């Protein structure tokens, strides 16, 4: 499964779903697409 956004992730080892992106700035997944 994946993470929903606002959950903490690693942008290079992204575990969040697509449409959302894992932020290197916020260090968590966000909806930005």
UniProtKB/Swiss-Prot annotation:
Looking up Pfam families in the UniProt record yields: Toxin_12
Q: Which residues form a coiled coil?
A: none
Q: What is this protein called?
A: Beta-theraphotoxin-Cm1a
* Homology family: Belongs to the neurotoxin 10 (Hwtx-1) family. 04 (CcoTx1) subfamily.
Q: Does the keyword Transferase apply?
A: no
Q: Which GO terms describe its cellular component?
A: extracellular space
Q: What is the effect of changing residue 5 to I?
A: Important increase in potency toward Nav1.7/SCN9A, and low potency on Nav1.4/SCN4A and Nav1.5/SCN5A; synthetic variant D1Z/M5I/K18Y/R24Ka and synthetic variant D1Z/M5I/R27Na
Give the UniProt subcellular location, in the record's own words: Secreted
Positions of disulphide bridges: 2-17, 9-22, 16-29
Question: What role does this protein play?
Answer: Inhibits many voltage-gated sodium channels and one voltage-gated calcium channel (Cav2.2/CACNA1B (IC(50)=400 nM), Nav1.2/SCN2A (IC(50)=3-70 nM), Nav1.1/SCN1A (IC(50)=523-1060 nM), Nav1.7/SCN9A (IC(50)=129.1-5120 nM), Nav1.4/SCN4A (IC(50)=263-888 nM or >10 uM) and Nav1.5/SCN5A (IC(50)=188-323 nM or >10 uM)). It acts by shifting the voltage dependence of channel activation to more depolarized potentials and by blocking the inward component of the sodium current. It shows moderate affinity for lipid bilayers.
- Report the domain remarks: The presence of a 'disulfide through disulfide knot' structurally defines this protein as a knottin.
Where Leucine amide occurs, residue numbers?
33
Is the Glycosyltransferase keyword given for this protein?
no
Q: Which GO terms describe its molecular function?
A: calcium channel regulator activity; sodium channel inhibitor activity; toxin activity
Tissues expressing this chain: Expressed by the venom gland.
Q: What else is known?
A: Synthetic variant D1Z/M5I/K18Y/R24Ka has a N-terminal pyroglutamate and a C-terminal amidation. It shows an IC(50)=2.7 nM on Nav1.7/SCN9A and IC(50)>3 uM on Nav1.4/SCN4A and Nav1.5/SCN5A. Synthetic variant D1Z/M5I/R27Na has a N-terminal pyroglutamate and a C-terminal amidation. It shows an IC(50)=2.8 nM on Nav1.7/SCN9A and IC(50)>3 uM on Nav1.4/SCN4A and Nav1.5/SCN5A.
Biological process GO terms, please?
A: envenomation resulting in negative regulation of voltage-gated sodium channel activity in another organism
Q: Which UniProt keywords apply?
A: Amidation, Calcium channel impairing toxin, Disulfide bond, Ion channel impairing toxin, Knottin, Neurotoxin, Pharmaceutical, Secreted, Toxin, Voltage-gated calcium channel impairing toxin, Voltage-gated sodium channel impairing toxin
Highest taxon of the lineage: Eukaryota
